């Protein structure tokens, strides 16, 4: 499930 | 450099970092840690144009960890040389690092057993589980395996969450919970009818074992950054779409009863 992927911002 | 060919081109510069950990525990009946370890890896899946130089930073020294090994592409970082590593990665999927920790492990579940002998023909077995992590997070695929004596005839069992069944062929009660939030508890109670046996020795109780999946690294490791520099194509960080996932799983996660 794609909800487990978090963004890495920077 | 042998592991990445020249001329790679993608419409969409994107990468995925998978932090995958197995947490192992042997706990005493009274809640003393006899042994614990995490075995962990970081898998990188990248579709990056050209020959990008990458810098991977974590929240802790990787260069509270042991038996830490790196892909052949990995080099010392210039800056943050203790918490990061630098590399031109292989294209697609590869294992960046593999590691072991023993220190400061989050044990996502506490198992509290109670066995009571009611006469000679009856055993009462009760287990409480407690989720030890943030209440905003969910554990899933929870299974508690409770051993039963070989002279078990009948079992009655109920639980306050999920479903349980006695599996006579496995000498175990199996308790399944689809999902459980952090800082919660549940209980199972079984009554076990015992038959007469020539066994003179008292039941040598196997430990209670758990399976679970949790959306965090039980080591406490966190990815802080993945920086990218492609000198020739001149794209940088804001050009690259970057994702991280943490999956913590039980390995051998045992509590003596």
Numbering used by the authors:
A (entry chain DDD): 107 to 116
B (entry chain AAA): 159 to 221, 242 to 435
Provide text from the study.
Proper operation of the pivotal CME cargo adaptor AP2 requires membrane-localized Fer/Cip4 homology domain-only proteins (FCHO). FCHO1 and FCHO2 are similar in overall domain arrangement —folded N-terminal acidic phospholipid-binding homodimerization F-BAR domains and C-terminal folded μ-homology domains (μHD) separated by a ~300-residue, low-complexity intrinsically disordered protein linker, which has been suggested to participate in AP2 activation, although how it does so is undetermined. We dissect the network of interactions between the FCHO interdomain linker and AP2, which concentrates, orients, tethers, and partially destabilizes closed AP2 at the plasma membrane.
Crystals of a complex of Cμ2 and a peptide corresponding to this WxxL signal were grown, diffracted to 1.7-Å resolution, and were solved by MR using 1.9-Å unliganded Cμ2 as a search model. These binding modes are likely to be in dynamic equilibrium with each other. The absence of WxxL in the C block of neuronally enriched FCHO1 but its presence in the ubiquitously expressed FCHO2 may reflect the paucity of YxxΦ-containing cargo found in synaptic CCVs that could compete out WxxL from Cμ2, which, if it did not occur, could slow or stall CCV formation. Thus, C blocks of all muniscin family members can bind to the α-appendage platform in a manner that is competitive with the binding of FxDxF and DP[FW] motifs of accessory CME proteins, and in addition, the partially overlapping WxxL sequence found only in FCHO2 can bind to the Cμ2 YxxΦ cargo–binding site and therefore potentially stabilize the unclosed but not-yet-open form of AP2.
